[PDB]
Amino acid sequence: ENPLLALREKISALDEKLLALFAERRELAVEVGKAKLLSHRPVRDIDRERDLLERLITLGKAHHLDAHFITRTFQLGIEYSVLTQQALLEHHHHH
Amino acid sequence: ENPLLALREKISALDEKLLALFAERRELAVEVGKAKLLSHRPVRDIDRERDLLERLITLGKAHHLDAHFITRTFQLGIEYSVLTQQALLEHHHHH
């Protein structure tokens, strides 16, 4: 009974759930972009971004996840949300 | 209400679920490392890592998630799992 096969299948299941949450996070970024456009609020606030990241680092430490790994991972997520919101603004200004 | 406040709270809930899955993924990495040691597979398999990443990119595209974002995010995740498995092999000094 090769125990590696069952473990790799559980990791694949976990990775599919991560992708589904990434997709949901992107839908939310679109909604944020829309609300900002309706509210005339800018996309970027680098103080907001940095404070968000500090909070994620603290929540991560409760799970014993390395601060550096959390920083790098969530910097990607924040950047992707911002790119998504900016692309939304940019599309509607092309009219 | 201010619709941005509800959206940012849903994004925070989503980020807490991501952290929980990151934690679970790390526990699984430890189990994989153990099983490899018991099975005499080497701790690193760079072909496995590269093939996994390609699969995740394709599953991501089905969710309309950018390939570059997927690539960068899962490169971090895979590296984190691998460092964990290597540390377990190295701790075989104590074992």
From Swiss-Prot, chains A, B:
Keyword annotations: Amino-acid biosynthesis, Aromatic amino acid biosynthesis, Cytoplasm, Isomerase, Lyase, Multifunctional enzyme, Phenylalanine biosynthesis
Q: List cellular component terms (GO).
A: cytoplasm
Q: Which residues form the Chorismate mutase domain?
A: 1-89
The answer, when asked if Hydrolase is one of the entry's keywords, is: no
Effect recorded for E49 to A/D/Q: Important decrease in catalytic efficiency and affinity
Q: Which residues bind substrate?
A: R8, R25, K36, D45, E49, S81, Q85
Give, from the UniProt record, the effect of changing K36 to A/Q/R.
Answer: Important decrease in catalytic efficiency and affinity
Listed GO MF terms? chorismate mutase activity; prephenate dehydratase activity; protein homodimerization activity
In Gene Ontology terms, what is a biological process of this protein? tyrosine biosynthetic process
Q: Where, per UniProt, does this protein localize?
A: Cytoplasm
Q: State the superkingdom.
A: Bacteria
This protein's major location comes to: cytoplasm
| The protein's role, per its UniProt record | Catalyzes the Claisen rearrangement of chorismate to prephenate and the decarboxylation/dehydration of prephenate to phenylpyruvate.
Q: How does it assemble?
A: Homodimer.
What is this protein identified as? Bifunctional chorismate mutase/prephenate dehydratase
Protein's organism: Escherichia coli (strain K12)
State the organism's lineage. Bacteria, Pseudomonadati, Pseudomonadota, Gammaproteobacteria, Enterobacterales
**Underlying gene:** pheA
